[PDB]
Design an enzyme around this catalytic site. Structure first.
Site, short mmCIF file in Angstrom:
data_model
loop_
_atom_site.label_atom_id
_atom_site.label_comp_id
_atom_site.label_asym_id
_atom_site.label_seq_id
_atom_site.Cartn_x
_atom_site.Cartn_y
_atom_site.Cartn_z
N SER B 64 85.26 61.06 52.83
CA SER B 64 84.08 60.87 53.65
C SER B 64 84.47 60.55 55.08
O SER B 64 85.56 60.05 55.36
CB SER B 64 83.19 59.76 53.08
OG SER B 64 83.94 58.56 52.99
N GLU B 144 74.99 61.96 53.84
CA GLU B 144 74.62 60.58 53.55
C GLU B 144 73.51 60.14 54.51
O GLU B 144 73.73 60.09 55.72
CB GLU B 144 75.82 59.63 53.68
CG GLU B 144 75.45 58.17 53.33
CD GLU B 144 76.64 57.20 53.29
OE1 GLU B 144 77.79 57.61 53.56
OE2 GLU B 144 76.41 56.01 52.98
N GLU B 150 71.87 53.22 62.80
CA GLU B 150 73.16 53.90 62.84
C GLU B 150 73.04 55.30 63.41
O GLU B 150 73.96 55.78 64.09
CB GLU B 150 73.76 53.95 61.43
CG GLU B 150 74.01 52.55 60.92
CD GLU B 150 75.12 52.44 59.91
OE1 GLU B 150 75.47 53.44 59.24
OE2 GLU B 150 75.64 51.31 59.78
N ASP B 177 72.56 55.65 49.76
CA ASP B 177 73.27 54.38 49.88
C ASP B 177 72.24 53.26 49.76
O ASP B 177 71.30 53.22 50.55
CB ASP B 177 74.04 54.33 51.22
CG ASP B 177 74.79 53.04 51.45
OD1 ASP B 177 74.23 51.96 51.20
OD2 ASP B 177 75.93 53.08 51.95
N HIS B 180 71.35 51.28 52.88
CA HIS B 180 70.48 51.99 53.81
C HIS B 180 69.08 52.16 53.23
O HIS B 180 68.08 52.01 53.95
CB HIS B 180 71.10 53.34 54.16
CG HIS B 180 72.38 53.22 54.91
ND1 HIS B 180 72.50 52.43 56.04
CD2 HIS B 180 73.60 53.77 54.70
CE1 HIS B 180 73.73 52.52 56.50
NE2 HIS B 180 74.42 53.32 55.71
N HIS B 203 76.12 55.41 47.00
CA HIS B 203 76.80 54.16 47.30
C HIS B 203 75.98 53.01 46.76
O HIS B 203 74.82 52.84 47.14
CB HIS B 203 77.00 53.98 48.79
CG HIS B 203 78.20 54.69 49.32
ND1 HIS B 203 78.39 54.95 50.66
CD2 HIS B 203 79.26 55.22 48.67
CE1 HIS B 203 79.53 55.60 50.82
NE2 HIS B 203 80.07 55.79 49.62
N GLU B 238 80.45 50.17 47.14
CA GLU B 238 80.85 50.04 48.53
C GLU B 238 80.56 48.62 49.00
O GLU B 238 79.44 48.12 48.82
CB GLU B 238 80.13 51.04 49.44
CG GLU B 238 80.51 50.92 50.93
CD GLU B 238 79.98 52.07 51.78
OE1 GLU B 238 78.76 52.34 51.74
OE2 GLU B 238 80.79 52.70 52.48
MG LIG Z 1 77.54 54.22 52.54
#
Ligand SMILES: [Mg+2]
Ligand SMILES: [Mg+2]
Ligand SMILES: [Mg+2]
Ligand SMILES: [Mg+2]
Lengths: 284, 282, 282, 284
Positions: B64, B144, B150, B177, B180, B203, B238
């Site tokens: 990644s 992702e 971000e 994720d 997120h 994730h 993660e």
């Molecule tokens: Mg992630």
């Protein structure tokens, strides 16, 4: 404050005269106790017009802001003190009872590295001077913990309390926000617990800034913990149906948070009022 | 990718020879099925050493990255394509099965306004070229979705699916994720629901990037919804514990996310494995 | 059955002529798609009056019951079949599309030991005969899993599915109830997951039988999982507010479950409809 | 009590001599602070054998029960007093520090109608007499709120406090149970809130009596509210891996609550210890 209130981004982008008219009219339709008015362009606020609206409609008010970069307290403390003095005077002039929010830095403030003692020392000097000015105008100050992406200095209930104790004033309270705590607190109730001795205001804001009750915030934990600590301050909605331009870059609302104010107020406020009654919050 | 894995950031963000050895040793210690290899500097990866390590230890892998600013796809698509081709080739040559992450942009993109068709047109051109290159090397690409702070372009499962449909390749999947989604999804299960036809990787990260099980993520809703859509992709833990400081600062880590590895791995991985068993993902 | 409905217990447990009128009036007031009619005394139901009410008001319906002790299927199967045949005919003749509930036993069954094959064999013989009668009248049967204290035989989604497989009919579905799942299921979504192939009906009831949204049920997990399995059956609100005292006492209601109808319906129905919209069941 | 403990149904069906040996050994392997011993067959308990086991292994203990129907306090109060005196004496003799549980009625007690003032009068007289006898033996009494299907008299934290206030004895505390609160409390934190002045013991029991953390109980709300009220009493696991025969009919465990004791203790105890740490419970 006490009871239920709404940040006026629910109804207007700017606190100009037409926006004040629109927001106050919308507020009385929901029977809230107060509104929270952004103090982002103090010289532009018509305080006489706002005060007349507030008193006519029996609405209480407080103000909130983030500092512009030219006046970030961490790095430009003299400019921050001058800016906060202006904002405090205008808040008091319109009948506001406190100035809260990110009064110690910027919405979107980021050095790229963790916060330093030199920055906190500057902030403490700024807030000490601002709190003395607030006292001379009869209002209090609030320090809002915001998430890591909006500010690098005060992100948790425990950090906000650390700053209130570092400053050592008697008229600064802690302001928490469930949207920020959803990211920052290791269990959302921990932010409330950590802030309990100074907590007087909370943004009941959903995890995506949309409709309370329909995101990821742990509302039952939030309300149970507020009841347990005897919270009796302001319960305020914050949903960016409209976005004040001076903070849009930092608040990162790139798509609609919800369909319209009617959806957020029509579904979110009854949810929050019902939860406050369910857990027996003081004043409910 | 199937079963449980770890993003190796907890041991290795710089995938050099000792870092690769250190991360594979951790993967064996925690008995995972696969690792996710971050590629901060794809040209420097020793593909044969990593391939041999993975095969000797019966470990699967994917890679990644996020694009650096000089190659942000929305504004510099030719440079994005060049960067992604190098990373795709390194991924394939080390035996990785996909390149995932923020492959459509970078951490730190923000215009102050909503994403535009012009930006999405450039991202689609980049992802089309990258997907073609990935197919020629026999690997897939993952997009992702990351939170609003971000990157302003792909924040939700539904936005990720819209881009996959816009590109029209068959080897691009959605990578969600939970950290997120905890911010972006209107109810956390909705990210999984919206992405269900394309979701191959998730994730599993706590809301504060600390210890899974001990934050604000709605884990029961996450795992029940994964089971209900029949998810059989990668369950990748993660955490930002022990990230090198410069990487951590770039991800807005201003204070420790947890006490230490023993707290994060000793409590978080059993929690996630137990939940996967509880809801029948096992 | 599709869309939103209400169990009419909040207005009518005794389905006589004024009670039928009262419940249909409430159903129109709350703009529901269907009603569930409890049948405490099937022979007393005026099928023609109810059928005309439903057709004139564009309302769909199903019926439900639990077996009286004189006809508990586990111990008195032939009496159970006679009782169910009468109820099935009344349901079909009034225009109902299914008979659901505790049709396999009664509230108050408890041996003090685990359920036995002998009991399950009697239940299966009852259900097989009842299902054939239901098929001859063009309606389906629903098996409602209830908690351990009400009945010791079918408590979980997975137990209900096992009984459906034991019977081998094709017109028996699973009926779940969030109040019972809140006790019985190892994570509330697991009841929906286990029953997914047969789930056509769910009681949306708060953990204390009061106001949905204001108790301990995990509503986000419930709705996300329903959406994820593609649930297209009946979403039926159930609250014990304003039940007749004798019925309420038989259900272990020792104190008020909520303040009044305005609290339950004015807060709980919008909450459930909003959640159904949020997760895309609508 | 303080710290973490386990109801001994985790390990033994009855508190006989072999069962006491097995449970005490198991409790040490998990490094818990205390065990909770069912006092369901008082004449059969070898008190010196248990007392010696506890003292030898530095283990604290309390006892719990439900009244047998022959001595249900609401209808046969004189028999209830005599039974509780026997149970109190055995509890004290074995070194137990309290007698808790459904000391006011039966597990499975049900009249078919709501509780009456006359029934509460009888319970109050029983508990007053039992409280004096417990005082004479130096132990306290606990009143456990249980769900509507196990008892019709005391189902909520608020009902339990009402009884404790009615009796007026300062050596009776409230005992809550997350499995019961999952049904009975209108938001689980409300049980803890309502009982905060008298809450000294809580069963951290999963919604299906299985492994804590892997059912429907709202653990984050539970732990946040316990921390918020400053809970400092016993945190005790209760999972019916083994079922005492005298209460099996009332507890309604018709199928395994979990795979085995190693699964409940191996996964559930770390989860609860970790949550107590996370929310900073006094003594963790
Ligand atoms: Mg992630
Ligand atoms: Mg805020
Ligand atoms: Mg039901
Ligand atoms: Mg208990």
């Amino acid at each position: 404050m006490q009871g239920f209130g709404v940040h006026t981004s629910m109804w207007t982008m700017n606190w100009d005269r037409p926006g004040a008219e629109r927001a106050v009219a919308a507020a009385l339709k929901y029977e809230v106790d107060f509104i929270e008015i952004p103090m982002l362009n103090p010289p532009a606020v018509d305080t006489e017009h706002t005060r007349a609206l507030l008193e006519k409609n029996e609405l209480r008010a407080l103000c909130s802001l983030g500092l512009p970069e030219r006046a970030w307290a961490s790095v430009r403390p003299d400019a921050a003190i001058e800016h906060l003095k202006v904002a405090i005077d205008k808040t008091a002039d319109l009948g506001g009872e406190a100035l809260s929010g990110v009064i110690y830095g910027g919405i979107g403030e980021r050095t790229g590295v963790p916060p330093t003692e030199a920055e906190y020392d500057n902030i403490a000097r700024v807030l000490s001077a601002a709190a003395k000015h607030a006292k001379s105008r009869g209002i209090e100050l609030g320090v809002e913990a915001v998430n890591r992406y909006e500010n690098h200095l005060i992100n948790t209930g425990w950090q906000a309390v650390q700053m209130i104790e570092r400053v050592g004033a008697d008229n600064i309270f802690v302001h928490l926000d469930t949207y920020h705590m959803n990211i920052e607190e290791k269990g959302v109730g921990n932010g409330i617990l950590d802030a309990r001795e100074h907590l007087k205001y909370i943004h009941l804001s959903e995890s995506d800034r949309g409709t309370p009750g329909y995101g990821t915030c742990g509302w039952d934990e939030i309300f149970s913990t507020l009841a347990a600590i005897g919270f009796k301050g302001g319960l305020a909605m914050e949903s960016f149906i409209n976005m004040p331009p001076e903070v849009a870059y930092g608040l990162a609302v790139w798509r609609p948070v919800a369909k319209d104010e009617e959806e957020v107020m029509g579904n979110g406020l009854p949810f929050l009022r019902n939860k406050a009654k369910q857990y027996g919050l003081i004043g409910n």
